Amino acid sequence: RPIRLLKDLSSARDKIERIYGLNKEKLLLLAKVKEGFETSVFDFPFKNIQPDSPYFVCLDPPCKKESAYNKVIGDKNRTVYHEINKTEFENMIKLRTKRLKLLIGEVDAEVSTGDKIEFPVLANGKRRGFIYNVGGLVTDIAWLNIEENTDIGKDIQYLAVAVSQYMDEPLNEHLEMFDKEKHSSCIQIFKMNTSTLHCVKVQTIVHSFGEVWDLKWHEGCHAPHLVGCLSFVSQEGTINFLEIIDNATDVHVFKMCEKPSLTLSLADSLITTFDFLSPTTVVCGFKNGFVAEFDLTDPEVPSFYDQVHDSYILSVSTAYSDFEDTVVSTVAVDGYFYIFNPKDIATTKTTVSRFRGSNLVPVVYCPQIYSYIYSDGASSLRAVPSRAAFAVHPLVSRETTITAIGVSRLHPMVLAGSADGSLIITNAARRLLHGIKNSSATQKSLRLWKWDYSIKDDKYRIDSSYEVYPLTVNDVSKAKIDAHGINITCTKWNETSAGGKCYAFSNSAGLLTLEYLS
Amino acid sequence: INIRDHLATIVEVVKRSKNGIRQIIDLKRELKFDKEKRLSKAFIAAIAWLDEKEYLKKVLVVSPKNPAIKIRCVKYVKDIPDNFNATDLLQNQGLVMEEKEVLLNRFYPLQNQTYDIADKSGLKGISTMDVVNRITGKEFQRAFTKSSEYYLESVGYRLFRIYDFEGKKKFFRLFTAQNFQKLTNPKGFDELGKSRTDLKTLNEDNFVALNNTVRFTTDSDGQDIFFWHGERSLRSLQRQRAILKVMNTIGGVAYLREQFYESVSKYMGSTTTLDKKTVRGDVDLMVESEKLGARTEPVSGRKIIFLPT
Amino acid sequence: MKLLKDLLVDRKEFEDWKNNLTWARDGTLYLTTFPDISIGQPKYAKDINCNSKNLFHVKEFPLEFENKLDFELAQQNGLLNSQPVCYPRVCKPSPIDDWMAVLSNNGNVSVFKDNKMLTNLDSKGNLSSRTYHCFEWNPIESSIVVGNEDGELQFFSIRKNSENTPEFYFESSIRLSDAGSKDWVTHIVWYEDVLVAALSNNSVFSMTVSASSHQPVSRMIQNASRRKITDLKIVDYKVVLTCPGYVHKIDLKNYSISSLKTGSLENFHIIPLNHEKESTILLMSNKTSYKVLLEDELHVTADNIIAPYLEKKFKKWSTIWNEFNNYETTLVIHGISLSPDGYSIAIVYDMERVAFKYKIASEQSFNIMFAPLYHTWTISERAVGLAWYQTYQIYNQSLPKLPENFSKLLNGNYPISLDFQSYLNALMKSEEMRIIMFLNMTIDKPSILSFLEALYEYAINKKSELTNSFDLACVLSIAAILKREAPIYNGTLLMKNSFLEETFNLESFTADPETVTSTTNNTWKRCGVTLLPILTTHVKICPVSKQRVIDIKRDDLNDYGWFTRGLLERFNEISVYCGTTLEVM
């Protein structure tokens, strides 16, 4: 057959062998995922992500593959810090003074910096978890993971939030992505129990690296003195790795950083996004459209420095597999989405699409179904398998741009947040692993929450009401403008088995929110 | 045409221009180097060479009311041994001479960024050439314009697009709900969704069986085994807006006399008084729109305007 | 001397910043533009008027691809059939023969003659072994090497080309990769008797490859390493390769290694100045260029050859598109290539601002700059046709180095009487034939008297076989123009076209090279090779000498003999005056 457009893959078995190949050990995972999640339309049984489940499936990210601390850091490169008082902390990082009026169902509150609010009882069911107020622009969030075989309490878990001293203004001289900008910004590190949802701000780290994004914990940076190690790109144009050294106490501490354990930098170019290809090497993008793989052990010179885009590379993502090459995907302001193999870019570069030039394009990898998940830079969520770039399947349509996307290593549930304050959940596996014919009716999505705001009343008005949106396949792109603070800036599931039903999301005013899906 | 002979004429023509300044586009037009792109290239090169050799100086002049409307001009220096004709704009005071020597926020969507600058720019609005240049620079004008068509609107955070004219250039101008407020001369809360079923009912009752695909069973060896067998105009509106505030800043009443026309011109910001007919046209339009009441003083014959409230 | 005005390629795009420009034996440029190749087809004109457009005409070259890895599911390379719609990713012309080979996006190598496909290369093995990533042409003989995903350098070699379309067939494969390893071939270079190849893990192997040996010694000259090989070349048996921040020089006479820091991470292209007395290279990058002398020791010296021109152009452009120095700007080089004779370089480039660019196909354009690499130059036995003229024009019309004893003119001694089709081959392989072909590109009235003496001597020797009328008519014409005795024969020749037949007395063919008069009192002009009357609407025209040649594939009425058939079959495409391809109507 001349199999050259998605409509040629009419037979369900033909689709699966064309999109996923014939490696017997690879096909097992798809059968397990299908049976373990076909009935999981909007939620999944806790029993399916547990380490003993008959349907248990788990693919570790490449950074977890071997111990990295002695290679990436070690005693030769410990992070340099000093402790500080609350008076000087508040002198630089002017987090929001005036309280915000939240409404959550029937409850009002005026909520100050740090005011945890458990969900009040709501008419549509047993909501569990909390709203918060982090007090400035949440630019990124990152859940840590701990191996459940360790002596650490299986229900304790950690989360980090990167917070700007800048506020509800969306255009500022200080959030510029084009040029290098060092300024004071911070990381709030939270310890919480997945069992009782009780949470404490353990450490606050202050740094002059400017705003922080693409924030991720290195799951191989294990040492008895560390919580973990926290990795990010910063507005000073460098990649900074810093040690989250553990306290002898549950009491809060404020810290300032003089030198991070490992700084990746390059002459006359600013690094813009990054991802791990192994426990000790990272792919990264630059302002000038270049791509490079740095060695965390030998950070002086990159392994390669090749041009791949015409302008600012926005997001880079790794599609790891136990059966195929570690391909990398990239999108830029030039709108191209390219997939390539770092062994040789020039012989392997492939195009999935060209978008309208859009200044925030979330891209993530769903390792349970070997598919990239992306916003089209406008208002649709789409899936593309790494080995069949033409097989683009649209997942959901929204009236305003998709601004943040999250996915986990234990389940195929995708979370997407639009700049209208809507948060939606959908099962990507139901689209990828099944036939094309009845796609306009067999795949659906659910709104888990919606923020809203009043210009005159000045409230943030979180709506618990669930809404079902069916898949409009032939749909138009849309762009409804909405209140500056209500856009969703990040969204991520906890990926441990104990925490696997827990997720976190943030608006841009500061209203970080977590729920345990039970 | 051999440009090597004409360099002396270019310096003498600029030398003979008023105050030693000439617009480069107008200079091309005088010497008729506009007939062919071949002649255009020759002329631009000649102007650049005379600037580099210091016989002339390239200088900007900036519109006192619009920093984006700047005129490329040549200034005379010593003897030899953006394309709109701005000879209109050079007639004003226009004294903002300048001898020659990017805001894009990643985290908030582009929609909110054009909105914020269209708001921060105030009641005077902002031109598309200001928005593109300050947000993303000149190169992104394509992807910006193909994006703005999805959310800018023809005449609650809506953005309105309106035409404008300066010198000989016609361009679109952006305004927020500020326009609706100043045309009237901001929404409150909205309803919660009123959907009340338990998520368990949605995760159960919304399920539909999918097409048969790869499946498996576990053998007695504990081995996982497969089965797939069987499976009306901006200046008039701005003037009507002004005439209420120019009344109200004095009181609920005014007289339609010389010192009122002066005050309207002075609050508007003109260097010279507006023609009485131009002001009376907008006064009549807002009187007819019932924004103003008006009558003759019965003991003087002079005309009064007043707020009907 | 000033460089010619740049060739402005418009509305074309490139999919990646690799080297995209190659320059064939006949002077044809090939640019691997996306989605279709752009060919800088060569043309002749004396009034070049300082503009390169008068040498090269640019047109889309829409080849058609068929994919042997279609139907076959992708394995450890996930990208293999990821985009099923094929497009050209690499394109190289033959250095000694006259074909083109192209790597498709899905990893096939296919070989072509002009716009016609010859064969798609395939061999038995697993899916990865059938998938190619780099290929190279033998610099001495009709054969090709292909590097596959299994890490095997596979050989194919060529036969059947005289009888029918050239057969490309599978011969053997050296597994250069370690047993069960997953690394694959990325670069191959082949200079004289030595082949050098680089795998993905940066391991490099040098080996002598010859028809006389079955057992090439795969001596690994550089261990597996972290830094990627950006470029690889052979320069007077020294291997040269570059990586981010470094240039590595290796001597294959003793397998010793050496290094120098490049001082920048921008990609460096290696430009080997092969004709220089001391092995030397120019290194080129989007921001800086310099000359490295490859003696026993390395060195850094000024790129006085190329850099001054690029700096002038960049300053000129900056004066218009960056007059305030508001933007950081770069010289993007989409490709660099040496002329087939090695005396000139072609650089394809554009000047750009680092910014939020959103380009589109209609706004994209490129300048091709042609420049001389030396103060003196000579003919080369590799390059043919308009390739000689290209170098002559690039050197500001400065004449080549002629022999001191020969400065027609030379008409060198020819003590030969080889088999007839091969005799014409040996005749065209001679140095004296090459300088005559170049001289015709310079003089006011072209001539071929030296070549005619070779055919006269052959006909005079082969007197016992000149039995055919047309063959005799050709010989008589040669004898008369040469002022040497005409062989004795009598009677009338008959010649035909699709509607008309004319009888000519053999004596009616006077010594005049221009015209002939028929027995019916009708005048006709003589053909540029067989000297016969031009009676048909099917002649090919020489773009240099304006002469006409009868297309033997089109004639179906004239009863040509062995001499006439053999002459035309050997000159049905290549010009007898100048080596150029004749135009067709």
Side-chain angles (χ1 to χ4, degrees), chain C residues 113-395:
Chain C
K113 184 178 181 181
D114 300 344
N115 305 76
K116 291 81 172 182
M117 182 178 68
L118 296 169
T119 283
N120 192 329
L121 299 182
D122 202 23
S123 52
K124 285 185 178 180
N126 58 31
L127 295 307
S128 44
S129 68
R130 293 174 72 196
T131 304
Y132 311 110
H133 277 264
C134 195
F135 72 92
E136 193 49 74
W137 288 103
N138 179 329
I140 293 169
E141 296 184 353
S142 302
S143 55
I144 189 168
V145 64
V146 310
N148 74 14
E149 293 190 352
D150 265 32
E152 308 192 350
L153 302 176
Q154 308 217 326
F155 295 93
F156 294 75
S157 60
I158 308 167
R159 295 184 188 278
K160 201 171 183 177
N161 68 296
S162 183
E163 180 175 16
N164 276 315
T165 185
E167 73 181 336
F168 292 75
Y169 79 107
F170 176 53
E171 181 178 309
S172 65
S173 65
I174 302 164
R175 185 168 293 232
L176 203 76
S177 53
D178 294 338
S181 183
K182 55 182 165 69
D183 280 289
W184 38 241
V185 190
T186 67
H187 300 80
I188 305 167
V189 284
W190 195 356
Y191 170 86
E192 298 196 341
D193 298 338
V194 74
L195 180 150
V196 180
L199 306 185
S200 49
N201 59 24
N202 317 296
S203 61
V204 188
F205 302 79
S206 60
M207 63 230 85
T208 294
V209 177
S210 66
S212 61
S213 183
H214 314 289
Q215 69 278 14
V217 179
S218 53
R219 184 171 285 109
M220 182 260 276
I221 52 171
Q222 183 186 264
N223 302 292
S225 180
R226 185 172 77 94
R227 313 176 204 127
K228 285 303 314 294
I229 298 157
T230 285
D231 200 8
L232 172 67
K233 296 293 182 181
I234 298 154
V235 190
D236 303 331
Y237 290 86
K238 300 176 177 72
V239 164
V240 188
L241 67 78
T242 182
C243 299
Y246 291 98
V247 63
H248 302 298
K249 178 266 285 175
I250 305 180
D251 182 357
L252 281 55
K253 284 291 196 289
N254 64 25
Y255 311 102
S256 64
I257 305 164
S258 60
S259 306
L260 171 66
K261 283 176 61 71
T262 55
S264 182
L265 304 174
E266 279 286 344
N267 274 328
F268 283 96
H269 294 293
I270 300 161
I271 304 306
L273 306 182
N274 283 358
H275 300 292
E276 188 157 11
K277 294 184 180 180
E278 294 296 344
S279 40
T280 299
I281 73 184
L282 306 174
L283 294 188
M284 268 282 278
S285 76
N286 309 297
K287 286 180 176 279
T288 187
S289 65
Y290 48 78
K291 180 179 183 184
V292 188
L293 314 183
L294 273 64
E295 306 189 315
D296 293 343
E297 294 79 32
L298 299 172
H299 293 268
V300 64
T301 60
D303 174 10
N304 63 334
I305 308 183
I306 302 302
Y309 308 112
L310 295 173
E311 290 299 326
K312 184 177 180 180
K313 292 178 186 287
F314 190 49
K315 286 176 180 183
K316 194 87 181 181
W317 175 86
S318 299
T319 305
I320 310 301
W321 276 62
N322 193 16
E323 193 258 311
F324 286 108
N325 298 17
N326 282 343
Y327 310 101
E328 54 263 57
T329 48
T330 180
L331 165 59
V332 184
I333 297 154
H334 299 276
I336 314 180
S337 186
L338 297 177
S339 53
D341 65 6
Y343 291 110
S344 176
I345 202 171
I347 296 152
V348 53
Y349 69 97
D350 68 322
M351 321 292 203
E352 275 300 348
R353 284 107 83 135
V354 192
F356 294 112
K357 289 172 301 195
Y358 189 95
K359 294 184 296 184
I360 188 61
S362 60
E363 296 297 336
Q364 293 180 51
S365 65
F366 321 125
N367 296 274
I368 312 188
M369 191 178 82
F370 302 86
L373 292 172
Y374 302 88
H375 300 307
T376 55
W377 76 275
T378 76
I379 286 173
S380 72
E381 69 187 332
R382 299 187 182 177
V384 294
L386 277 155
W388 302 304
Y389 190 66
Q390 283 168 2
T391 298
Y392 155 79
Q393 285 294 2
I394 292 162
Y395 279 68

Side-chain angles (χ1 to χ4, degrees), chain A residues 23 69 109 116 131 146 148 187 191 195 219 243 371 411 470:
Chain A
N23 294 84
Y69 181 65
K116 187 194 67 155
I131 310 96
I146 295 178
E148 294 181 11
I187 304 176
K191 171 178 177 181
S195 53
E219 301 90 349
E243 284 180 313
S371 186
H411 57 69

Side-chain angles (χ1 to χ4, degrees), chain A residues 35 42 167 169 461 466 482, chain B residues 108 120 190 195 203 215:
Chain A
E35 203 69 2
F42 302 140
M167 298 297 173
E169 301 184 58
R461 305 172 63 255
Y466 300 138
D482 219 330
Chain B
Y108 289 99
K120 284 168 169 170
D190 195 10
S195 172
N203 195 49
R215 215 167 183 199

Side-chain angles (χ1 to χ4, degrees), chain A residues 12-14 16-17 20-24 26-36 38 432-434, chain B residues 211-217 224-231:
Chain A
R13 293 190 297 277
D14 293 4
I16 299 302
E17 73 185 36
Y20 296 111
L22 294 177
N23 294 84
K24 305 302 296 189
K26 184 170 181 164
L27 290 176
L28 296 172
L29 283 297
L30 307 187
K32 286 186 177 184
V33 172
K34 168 251 184 275
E35 203 69 2
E38 171 169 359
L432 274 299
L433 309 183
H434 301 275
Chain B
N211 307 112
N212 291 110
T213 188
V214 68
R215 215 167 183 199
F216 74 99
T217 61
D224 184 352
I225 296 294
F226 292 107
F227 74 95
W228 64 20
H229 46 282
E231 291 208 50

Side-chain angles (χ1 to χ4, degrees), chain C residues 462-477:
Chain C
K462 296 293 184 181
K463 198 171 177 184
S464 308
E465 297 198 306
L466 280 303
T467 60
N468 173 283
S469 54
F470 299 85
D471 289 359
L472 283 161
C474 183
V475 174
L476 290 165
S477 304

